[PDB]
Amino acid sequence: IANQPVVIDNGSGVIKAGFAGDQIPKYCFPNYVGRPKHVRVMAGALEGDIFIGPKAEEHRGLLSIRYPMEHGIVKDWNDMERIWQYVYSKDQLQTFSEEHPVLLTEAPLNPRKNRERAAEVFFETFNVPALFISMQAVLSLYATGRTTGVVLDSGDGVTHAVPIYEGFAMPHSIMRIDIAGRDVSRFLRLYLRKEGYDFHSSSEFEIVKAIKERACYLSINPQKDETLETEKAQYYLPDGSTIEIGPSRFRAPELLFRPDLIGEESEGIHEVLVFAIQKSDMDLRRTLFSNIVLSGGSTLFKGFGDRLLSEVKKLAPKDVKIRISAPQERLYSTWIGGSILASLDTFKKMWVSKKEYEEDGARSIHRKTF
Amino acid sequence: EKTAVVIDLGEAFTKCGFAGETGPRCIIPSVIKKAGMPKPIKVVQYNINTEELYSYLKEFIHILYFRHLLVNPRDRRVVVIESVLCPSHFRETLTRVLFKYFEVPSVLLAPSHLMALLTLGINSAMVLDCGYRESLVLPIYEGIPVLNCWGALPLGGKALHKELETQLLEQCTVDTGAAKEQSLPSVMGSIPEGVLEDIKVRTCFVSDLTRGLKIQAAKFNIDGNTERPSPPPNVDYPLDGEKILHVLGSIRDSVVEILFEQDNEEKSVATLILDSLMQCPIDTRKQLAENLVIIGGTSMLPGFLHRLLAEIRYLVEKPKYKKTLGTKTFRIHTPPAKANCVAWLGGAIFGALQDILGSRSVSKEYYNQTGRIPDWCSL
Amino acid sequence: DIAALVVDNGSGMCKAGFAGDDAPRAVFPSIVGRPRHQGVMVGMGQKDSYVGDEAQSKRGILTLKYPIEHGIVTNWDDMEKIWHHTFYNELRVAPEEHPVLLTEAPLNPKANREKMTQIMFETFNTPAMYVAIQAVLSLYASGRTTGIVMDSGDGVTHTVPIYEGYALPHAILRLDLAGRDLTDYLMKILTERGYSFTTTAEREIVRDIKEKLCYVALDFEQEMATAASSSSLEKSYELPDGQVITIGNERFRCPEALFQPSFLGMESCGIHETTFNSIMKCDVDIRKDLYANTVLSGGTTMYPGIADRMQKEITALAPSTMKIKIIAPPERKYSVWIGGSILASLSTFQQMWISKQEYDESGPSIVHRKCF
Amino acid sequence: DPKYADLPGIARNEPDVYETSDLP
Ligand SMILES: Nc1ncnc2c1ncn2[C@@H]1O[C@H](COP(=O)(O)OP(=O)(O)OP(=O)(O)O)[C@@H](O)[C@H]1O
Ligand SMILES: Nc1ncnc2c1ncn2[C@@H]1O[C@H](COP(=O)(O)OP(=O)(O)O)[C@@H](O)[C@H]1O
Ligand SMILES: Nc1ncnc2c1ncn2[C@@H]1O[C@H](COP(=O)(O)OP(=O)(O)O)[C@@H](O)[C@H]1O
Ligand SMILES: [Mg+2]
Ligand SMILES: [Mg+2]
Ligand SMILES: [Mg+2]
């Protein structure tokens, strides 16, 4: 098939869909399904029952939210199927699914059944001509245009570090932890409860996530900032009321680097990055320090680069160059890399044909990846 | 060493007394009667300017220390029971009131859930506190409160009082007695908090699991034909002397169903424990499931515990919890004190431990030197 | 007669007992657990750090650290805590009253043994002590004086050939692949299967799964094909919660890393190739005897069918005429300790102690002159 | 640069490279 492939970066928090030709993901929206909060049986209420994309943002107060993906693993497969069908809607891509081949993106070290069921859904419910599932860490280097680097993809659900040297991936050096943007949002909810502000509702999870996106910075010296009197930045709720966030602004994201404060048994973003570098072979390590590529939304935290540089400096060997290449487009780097990959003619030899899936069965999608 | 006093402040009621006592000496509404204003002001208020809160706490603690506890404040230590994730500003204001003004030796800001655990003698359980403002679940495992697996919902006594007021104002039938022996709905614009609280505690009750589910289904009544259970008889609650509010039978069992109603979000009082438990470490689940402790004034409503346990066992079988928490044996604890003052009883047990209480508590010299109260937030 | 203690500080599991006994008195995991939460108030009956089985029972809240990694003590405070628990709490004996016969793997850092001796003589004030090679003790336990011991425990797998009591230091071959590496690989393949285990507490659950279910396949490809084409090999395990999880081919892929380190990413020989290379490094005259007296030791050699697989692999590698005989006693998990007890029960061993007088005279470095 | 101007989450007013000082 010579039609333009469709690239669908499958985020835990925000999915990004588009065509491979485009330089940017033309379509992108949160990865959740919004249902009416009350069990509607009367007429005149929010009809349809399934609000996805900006529609869910229009009436966000009245909806109960449910994410299908958690920690990069699909939980509600019906909701994920609804999401993917909505990607092929009149609102997004205005096209039939049977025409275009598809490139998915999946987190590394995920369950095999997740990928198997995703392929089954994309080949059975949608009559797609072909499919290919890539890791986002491989795609970030495609997007940046470099052949080597350590990709630290800190998405909404999963935070993983992957070193690649000259296009060779180190499967045993990959590091992965579940402390990511959603966990930072949960900790921010807890700290805002400590401020005296309640966000119990699932819908209110969205506005505490908005507070995380708007006003939350990583302090190089958290003790000094805590001792220093905070400015108590004011934030506007959707309804109209103001809130003073206070010191929680710098306490919630701090758990990404030091999760053990809240008792979480996790390595921390700097720890997984450094250990992914160190587990690799020794001769590569210096170059792996000289090419660090950030990716994912959680890397967009204010002052994240400086704190990560400080941590890597104090953990790395002395007098070793470090280059945390943090492109401004790091939120959509994974999709841009997927588009660049799908543009290549080599992609023609990578995706599995529908007849190939029918004949070889499930194991094809496992073996053609590597 | 003199016996340390114990204070447990709450929106609805404050429990006060001495350590090493079988129960609190004093339990009163957390209000202060300022001159000139008919309805008194709530002492414990969050998100207010610190001067007003300081004055309120000063007056209330003075009332506690010179009306109910007949003893000087300077002599004896304090064991203040404050719930986990209590608002910070209220906490440092309370400690500042205790230190700067009263000059107590030291205040121990104990957590309510761990203290409630101490009363039973066990060292691990899933403590649910159904307070006035909100219900809160916290697991404790070997004296370590697992803050990571906390849970909370705003289904305490405040929401219940609001629901009662709404239902009464809808199905209002009050005999004014002044040429109004017939029903005269909503003669008064708003029912005071005291009347709602008395109606809730005296008349209302928590129905059985099956009856509650049938009531919830019949609320929608989609193609239903008298599927509701037969309600209890109506009760004629006297108001203000002459007035007689005919509290309907249906309200008495339907008002409290908001605690256990799911409403397309899978969030209720019962589901809260399961949600917290499913987040716990893999090894801690069983010991936390077999040890359940319920505290708080709302839990004292008649038939609450039976409905809660039945709803827990019912929701366990649902597909969300079937895989993980399916084969589990939940069991409720029966602490020696009434559920109003289990946390206070824990604080009282901790108070008589004179040797450790000096080291654990924060000395006034330390507070004067630093002015920073310890907290589980970053320092 | 004052009995001398024998303390096998394994990388994973610490064993301890009195000389002359048949089995160790105390056998507990060598872990130090610490509470995870810091900010919140701590309950009444608590310890700053838990050790041994106490940490294992309370592992749900604690975070565990192994003091010994790859047979090298990395945290000496934790190892000191482990020894204190071993002597005072478990054995319930004063360390100053008895000698102690510790054990160490071959080819370890010299500083490890030096610090071991220093800690034993200064902190605990034992009247004497000794450090012994684990393989030599395990050969003592089997009632042999000629043979090749492939002792594989939680941290390291070392092969030592011995002939008529004369060790051959230049033919010893050490590998860092053992135990913990297999547990981590089991975690990885379990994550591919669907069950995610990340915390240190879950490492104990994965270790228990490895102990209970895993086995060595005589033919790896045939068993893989059987697993693919049928569910006969699937077996169910119950977690402490009560969740039931099914393990399929992963039963015989976790221990297969012993014979194929390429699964773990290390470009090292398998245990069969390591044993064959160690035999071939020996002189030509004694090799036959070693082929007839291959001894398995350590806890990680307890997989079902490992003896048959090792016999098959060595027979394939070795010449046809030589007779291979892998000796795998049922109690081999404690064979490193038992021989140590024998070595402590001998009358001729009273001259092999490092007396405290000699330690004061020469310092810790005497451990390199006396022990080995 | 302007090709990413329309996207919501493009974080601007920050440097694209956080690196240690060069040493000869
Ligand atoms: N004996 C009782 N029987 C029934 N309900 C009661 C009883 N005592 C108090 N309540 C109700 O319980 C609620 C108060 O609970 P509780 O006294 O535990 O809260 P609190 O400590 O004041 O508040 P919070 O913990 O939120 O700070 C109110 O609804 C009150 O009406
Ligand atoms: N400026 C920002 N500050 C803080 N967090 C942000 C910012 N922008 C995005 N995020 C977070 O990043 C997450 C999106 O991650 P994403 O890149 O979608 O991960 P994935 O690889 O799963 O697609 C969101 O949940 C959001 O909370
Ligand atoms: N019955 C068994 N089956 C499989 N593996 C076992 C068995 N018993 C113990 N092990 C493994 O052996 C290891 C312990 O080995 P051990 O003899 O204690 O070595 P060391 O003495 O160096 O600690 C554990 O990590 C465990 O996984
Ligand atoms: Mg992504
Ligand atoms: Mg209470
Ligand atoms: Mg051993």
Residues 6+ away with beta carbon under 8 Å from B357: B4, B77, B79, B106, B108, B350, B351
Contact B111 C59 (CB under 8 A): no
Tell whether A367 is within 8 A of chain C (Cβ).
no
User: From the candidates A172, A251, A275, which should be mutated to test the interface with C, based on the most C CB atoms within 10 A?
Assistant: A172
| Three-class DSSP category at C73 | strand
Alpha carbon distance B360, B200 (integer Å): 40
Q: What is the resolution of this structure in A?
A: 3.4
Closest ligand to residue A154's CA: 2
Instruction: Quote the CA–CA distance of C6 and C17 in Å, as a whole number.
Output: 5
C-alpha of residue C13 to centroid of ligand 3, in Å:
8
B352-364 burial, b at 16+ Cβ within 10 Å, e below that, comes to bbeeebeebbbeb
Q: Which long-range contacts (CB under 8 A, 24 or more apart) does B164-170 make?
A: B164/B196, B164/B199, B164/B200, B164/B204, B164/B251, B164/B255, B165/B190, B165/B191, B165/B196, B167/B251, B167/B254, B167/B255, B168/B196, B168/B199, B168/B245, B168/B247, B168/B251
Would you tell me how many other CB atoms lie within 10 Å of the CB of residue A264? 20
Mutate to test the pocket of ligand 2, among A9, A69, A106, A213 (most ligand atoms within 8 A of CB): A213
> Closest Cα to atom 11, ligand 3: which residue?
C300
- By Cβ distance, the residue of A37, A195, A222 closest to B87 is A195
Contact between chains at D20 and A332 (C-beta distance less than 8 A):
no
Neighbours of A99 (CB within 10 A): 14
Whether A146 and chain D come into contact, CB under 8 Å, resolves to: no
CA separation, residue A142 to residues A10, A338, A343, B106, B217 (Å)? 17, 8, 11, 62, 55
User: Residue A76 carries which side chain, given as an amino acid letter?
Assistant: D
Radius of gyration for chain B, computed over Cα atoms and rounded to the nearest angstrom = 23
Structure tokens at C109: 């850092």
A25 close to ligand 2 (CB < 6 Angstrom): no
Residue A319 contacts D, CB cutoff 8 Å: yes
Smallest Cβ–Cβ distance between C44 and the set B143, B287, B324 belongs to B143
The Cα B14–Cα B64 span in angstroms is 9
CA dihedral B55→B61→B64→B70, nearest 10 degrees, is -120
Q: Smallest Cβ distance to A109: which of C38, C191, C200?
A: C191
* Cβ neighbours, 10 Å, residue B215: 19
Q: What are A82-90's contacts with CB under 8 Å, separation 24+?
A: A82/A33, A82/A50, A82/A52, A83/A15, A83/A31, A83/A33, A83/A52, A84/A8, A84/A121, A84/A122, A84/A126, A85/A125, A85/A126, A86/A52, A86/A53, A87/A8, A87/A15, A87/A17, A87/A27, A88/A126
CATH number at residue B253: 3.90.640.10
Measured CA to CA in angstroms, residue B326 lies from A243, A303, B204 at distances of: 41, 45, 32
Distance CA B185, CA B174 (A): 6
Q: Is A151 helix (H, G, I), strand (E, B) or coil?
A: strand
Question: Is A259 a pocket residue for ligand 2 (Cβ < 6 Å)?
Answer: no
Whether A and B touch, i.e. at least 3 CB pairs below 8 A, reads as yes
Rounded CA separation B1/A334 (Å): 67
Whose structure tokens read 């958690």? A70
B177 vs B257: CA distance, rounded Å: 33
Expressed in angstroms and rounded, the spacing between residue B193 Cα and the centre of ligand 2 is 45
Closest C-alpha among A64, A66, A54 to residue A201: A64
| Beta bridge partners of residue B111, listed in sequence order | B82
Q: Which two tokens stand for residue C359?
A: 């330690």
Based on its alpha-carbon atoms, the radius of gyration of chain A, rounded to whole angstroms, reads: 21
Is C63 within 8 Å of A178 when comparing Cβ atoms? no
∠ CA A130-A131-A135, nearest 5°, is 160
Rounded Cα distance, A138 and B375, in Å = 43
The finding on whether C331 has its CB within 6 A of some atom of ligand 3 is no
- Residue C200: list chain B partners with CB under 8 A: none
Q: Which residues, other chains included, contact A325 with Cβ-Cβ below 8 Å and sequence gap of 6+?
A: A144, A149, A291, A292, A293, A294, D16, D17
Closest chain B residue to C200, measured at CA: B281
Per the document, the length of chain B is 379
Query: Whole domain around residue B181: which residue ranges?
Result: 157-259
The three-class DSSP label of residue B156 is coil
Question: Experimentally, how was this structure solved?
Answer: cryo-EM
- Domain holding A230, by residue range, is 181-262
Of all residues in chain A, the one with the smallest CA distance to C195 is A111
Instruction: Please say whether the beta carbons of B218 and B149 come within 8 A.
Output: no
Q: CA A167 to CA A336: how far, in whole Å?
A: 18
What's the gap in Å between A136 CA and the centre of ligand 4?
A: 6
User: What would the two tokens of residue B168 be?
Assistant: 């009464």
Q: What is the DSSP string of B228-271?
A: SPPPPPPEEEEETTTEEEEE-HHHHHHTTHHHH--TTTT-SHHH
Helical segments of chain B, H only: 50-63, 88-96, 112-120, 157-170, 193-202, 209-220, 249-254, 257-260, 269-278, 285-290, 304-316, 319-325, 342-351, 354-360, 364-370
CATH of the domain at A217: 3.90.640.10
Question: Are D19 and A24 inside 8 Å of each other by CB?
Answer: no
Q: Does the distance separating the beta carbons of A324 and D4 come in below 8 Å?
A: no
The whole-angstrom separation of Cα C67 and Cα C60 is 19
> Nearest C-alpha of chain A: how many angstroms from D2?
11
Residue of chain A whose alpha carbon sits nearest to that of B265: A64
CB B320 within 8 A of CB B293: no
3-state helix, strand, coil in chain B (%, to 5): 40, 20, 40
- Nearest ligand, CA of residue C251? 3
Q: Tell me the CA distances in angstroms from A127 to A113, A120, A355, A357, one per residue in order.
A: 20, 10, 11, 12
Contacts of C44 in chain B (CB under 8 A): 118, 123, 143, 350, 353
Show residues of chain B in contact with C202, CB under 8 Å. 282
Structure tokens at C21: 């006994």
Instruction: Tell me the ligand closest to B42's alpha carbon.
Output: 1
**Amino acid sitting at position B172:** C
DSSP helix/strand/coil, A279? helix
Hunting for tokens 């998915």 — which residue is that?
A: A104
- Chain A interface includes C246 (CB < 8 A): no
Question: CA neighbours within 13 Å on the CB side: how many for B90?
Answer: 23
Sheet of C50-51, strands arranged across: C50-51, C32-35, C62-65
Q: Report the alpha-carbon distance of residue B201 to residue B300 in Å, rounded.
A: 9
Residue B101: CB partners within 8 Å, gap ≥ 6? Answer: B58
Note whether B255 and B159 are within 8 A (CB).
no
Distance from CA of D12 to the nearest CA of A (A): 6
**Sequence-ordered alpha helix ranges (H) in chain C:** 53-57, 76-84, 110-118, 134-141, 180-193, 200-213, 220-229, 256-259, 271-281, 284-292, 306-317, 335-345, 356-362, 367-370
The Cβ of residue C19 has, within 10 Å, a number of other Cβ atoms equal to 21
- Give the type of residue at A343: S
Q: Which residues pair with C157 in a beta bridge?
A: C152, C175
- 10 Å CB burial of residue D19 (0-12, 13-18, 19+) is middle
* Torsion sign over Cα C357, C360, C364, C369: negative
End-to-end alpha-carbon separation of chain C, Å? 26
Give CA–CA dist B192/B199, Å, rounded: 11
Q: Which residues pair with A73 in a beta bridge?
A: A70
Set of chain A residues whose Cβ sits within 8 Å of the Cβ of D18: 305-306, 308-309, 323-324, 326
CB count within 10 Å of CB A307 equals 23
Minimal CA–CA distance to C80: which of C94, C89, C67?
Answer: C67
- Between the CA of residue B183 and those of A231, B236, B255, C142, what are the distances in Å? 57, 12, 21, 98
Question: Which residue matches tokens 């009247």?
Answer: C127
> In ligand 2, which atom is closest to the CA atom of A334?
21
Residue A337, classified by CB atoms within 10 Å of its CB into exposed (0-12), middle (13-18) or buried (19+), is buried
Residues in chain C: 372
Nearest beta carbon to residue B283 from set C41, C44, C201: C201
8 Å CB contact between A331 and D10: yes
A171 touching C, CB under 8 A? yes
Q: How many Å lie between the alpha carbon of A55 and the closest alpha carbon of chain C?
A: 34
Enter the tokens of residue B185. 């709905």
Question: How far apart are alpha carbons D15 and A327 in whole angstroms?
Answer: 8
Cβ distance A254 to B46 less than 8 Å, yes or no, reads no
The answer to whether A55 touches A46, Cβ cutoff 8 Å, is no
In chain D, residues with a C-beta closer than 8 Å to the C-beta of A23 are 3
Distance (Å, rounded) from C-alpha A223 to C-alpha A196? 22
Closest CA to C70 of C183, C173, C154, C187: C154
A263: nearest CB among B147, B220, B263 = B147
In a mutational test of the pocket of ligand 1, which residue from B28, B31, B90, B201 has the highest number of ligand atoms less than 8 Å from its CB?
B201
Cβ within 8 Å of residue A89, ≥6 positions away: none
Contacts of A108 in chain C (CB under 8 A): none
Cα C155 to ligand 3 centre (Å): 10
Contact A360, A129 (CB under 8 A): no
Q: Supply A334's token pair.
A: 């994974």
Chains that touch B (3 or more CB pairs under 8 A): A, C
Sign of torsion over alpha carbons C65, C70, C74, C80: positive
